[PDB]
A paper describes a structure:
The SARS-CoV-2 Omicron variant of concern evades antibody-mediated immunity that comes from vaccination or infection with earlier variants due to accumulation of numerous spike mutations. The Omicron spike (S) glycoprotein, which promotes viral entry into cells, harbors 37 residue mutations in the predominant haplotype relative to Wuhan-Hu-1 S, as compared to approximately 10 substitutions in both SARS-CoV-2 Alpha and Delta VOC. The Omicron receptor-binding domain (RBD) and the N-terminal domain (NTD) contain 15 and 11 mutations, respectively, which lead to severe dampening of plasma neutralizing activity in previously infected or vaccinated individuals. To understand the Omicron antigenic shift, we determined cryo-electron microscopy and X-ray crystal structures of the spike protein and the receptor-binding domain bound to the broadly neutralizing sarbecovirus monoclonal antibody (mAb) S309 (the parent mAb of sotrovimab) and to the human ACE2 receptor.
Focused classification and local refinement of the S309-bound RBD (domain B) and of the S2L20-bound NTD (domain A) were used to account for their conformational dynamics and improve local resolution of these regions to 3.0 and 3.3 Å resolution, respectively. (C) The S2L20-bound Omicron NTD with mutated, deleted, or inserted residues rendered or indicated as red spheres. Many of these mutations have been described in previously emerged VOC: del69-70 was found in Alpha, T95I was present in Kappa and Iota, and G142D was present in Kappa and Delta. T95I, del211, L212I, and ins214EPE are outside the NTD antigenic supersite but in the vicinity of the epitope targeted by the P008_056 mAb, suggesting these mutations could putatively modulate recognition of similar mAbs or have another functional relevance. Although the region comprising del143-145 is weakly resolved in the map, it is expected to alter antibody recognition due to the introduced sequence register shift whereas G142D is incompatible with binding of several potent NTD neutralizing mAbs, such as S2X333, due to steric hindrance. Moreover, del143-145 is reminiscent of the Alpha del144 which was also isolated as an escape mutation in the presence of mAb S2X333 and led to viral breakthrough in a hamster challenge model. These data suggest that G142D and del143-145 account for the observed SARS-CoV-2 Omicron evasion from neutralization mediated by a panel of NTD mAbs. (D) Zoomed-in view of the Omicron NTD antigenic supersite overlaid with the S2X333 Fab (used here as an example of prototypical NTD neutralizing mAb) highlighting the binding incompatibility; the modeled clash between S2X333 W106 and NTD G142D is indicated with an asterisk.
Residue numbers in the entry:
A (entry chain J): 14 to 18, 21 to 69, 77 to 144, 156 to 176, 186 to 210, 212 to 214, 9215 to 9217, 215 to 245, ...
B (entry chain A): 1 to 104
C (entry chain B): 1 to 61, 63 to 121
Write the structure that this text describes.
Amino acid sequence: QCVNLRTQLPPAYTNSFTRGVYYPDKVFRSSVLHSTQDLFLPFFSNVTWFHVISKRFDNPVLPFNDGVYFASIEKSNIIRGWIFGTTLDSKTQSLLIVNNATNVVIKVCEFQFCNDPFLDHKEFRVYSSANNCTFEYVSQPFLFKNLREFVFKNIDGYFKIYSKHTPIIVREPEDLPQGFSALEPLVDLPIGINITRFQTLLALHGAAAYYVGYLQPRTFLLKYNENGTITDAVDCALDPLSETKCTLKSF
Amino acid sequence: VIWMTQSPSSLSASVGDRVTITCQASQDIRFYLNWYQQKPGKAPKLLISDASNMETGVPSRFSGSGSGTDFTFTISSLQPEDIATYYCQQYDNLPFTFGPGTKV
Amino acid sequence: EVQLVESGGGVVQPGGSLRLSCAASGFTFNSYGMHWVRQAPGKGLEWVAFIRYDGGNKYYASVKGRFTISRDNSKNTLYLQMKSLRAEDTAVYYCANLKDSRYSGSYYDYWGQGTLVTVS
Ligand SMILES: *[C@@H]1O[C@H](CO)[C@@H](O)[C@H](O)[C@H]1NC(C)=O
Ligand SMILES: *[C@@H]1O[C@H](CO)[C@@H](O)[C@H](O)[C@H]1NC(C)=O
Ligand SMILES: *[C@@H]1O[C@H](CO)[C@@H](O)[C@H](O)[C@H]1NC(C)=O
Ligand SMILES: *[C@@H]1O[C@H](CO)[C@@H](O)[C@H](O)[C@H]1NC(C)=O
Ligand SMILES: *[C@@H]1O[C@H](CO)[C@@H](O)[C@H](O)[C@H]1NC(C)=O
Ligand SMILES: *[C@@H]1O[C@H](CO)[C@@H](O)[C@H](O)[C@H]1NC(C)=O
């Protein structure tokens, strides 16, 4: 049974700085500077900041565009899943990714989603019904405060998820932390559907916040250290100084 | 380019009457049709999306249905506040197009 | 509140040019695509142009080759540059964010007030 849970507030913005870099492929490299072209969140971009405070719970339907950078900071594990699709109703196949205490369930079905879907661990009040599914996958859960970052890409039918989890110190401004951390590949799902919109699923029973950015086709120079770990990167289309650094292959 | 047409171009109805407007597309656009209502001097307001989905805040007296090339917009009981020009618009492919508009 | 404000209208001569602009606020302008729609007196709605969120791909209607669409995401401003204007281009020009499940992905439908452009 769908339950209609509000006012609409204007968005906040935060400074992305140097974040959103992920390993472009599954190839070991070390002690080398590698130039690659792929979809990355632009350096020093403007990222949309949403709030979950409890009396406001931001969970709007957002565009997916060409890929989404998603991040959240919390302790109570309020953000537990995502919905990806087009019309997000019984007319088309949609992707539902939901985490719980023991596992993660990923399935693609013609879901009739609720006007304001959520989880309620007294159970799913995400959809009222579902028809014939095309994809099923079950594995281990994907999910000082916990900083969780994800990259969602949809290329040639493959829904690629990258992720990173680090502990962060609490700062009063409650902004994005500075520093460099690369995202490792998590899962690659052979689904084959058209994602144009997505929505964040919140679990009810605290405070949390999340950020949304969009990826662009850009050229990056990635620095691999002795242990094949990416420790730095240059956005070759940010400014004239970065352009020179990329040309000369030097940080 | 997809051609859009509507019929009748104008209709006369009283308060309490049932009003139906037909939209037809020259090409199959599945369920990607928007319905707009425009009052004189104002920008168009969206009432129905994806053929049959009602927008939030739209009165229950409004409805619509259809798929492919033939779509219908219905007012179950015309109100004095429902005197406007109604347009259908397709967004299956670019360029997007609007129909001629029906005068109620 | 979400508000789209057109400006730059007025009266021009045939063969001349005019640059219109739309100021956006109250929403994440830089993540959405935008459309231009015009309506001449006595006529219905006519679609003119569309630009993607990244200011990359551009699409045009009757106007292709004469009108250029562009945007600046640092100013939240949408622009339309009209060259070689004709008498038939007299209309009220609106900027809009049209609900679209296939291309822009917008879940919300927004319109401005419109600005009048007269060619004579
Ligand atoms: C939520 O709204 C829907 C209409 O969209 C209605 O059918 C449903 O009963 C409402 N849920 C509750 C708990 O009232
Ligand atoms: C968007 O980014 C620009 C830098 O290009 C910055 O000047 C502007 O203030 C940012 N917008 C917001 C709302 O912070
Ligand atoms: C988590 O989901 C799995 C698969 O649906 C289910 O078997 C398991 O009981 C769920 N765990 C909890 C605590 O509900
Ligand atoms: C099976 O999927 C098709 C769409 O390909 C749908 O039309 C049909 O109703 C579904 N069958 C059932 C029992 O839902
Ligand atoms: C996905 O988008 C492509 C490009 O517009 C289109 O050709 C394809 O038919 C779409 N898939 C579905 C199921 O609509
Ligand atoms: C590489 O890993 C080893 C531990 O196996 C560590 O001692 C060394 O400092 C690392 N090198 C770099 C550049 O991080």
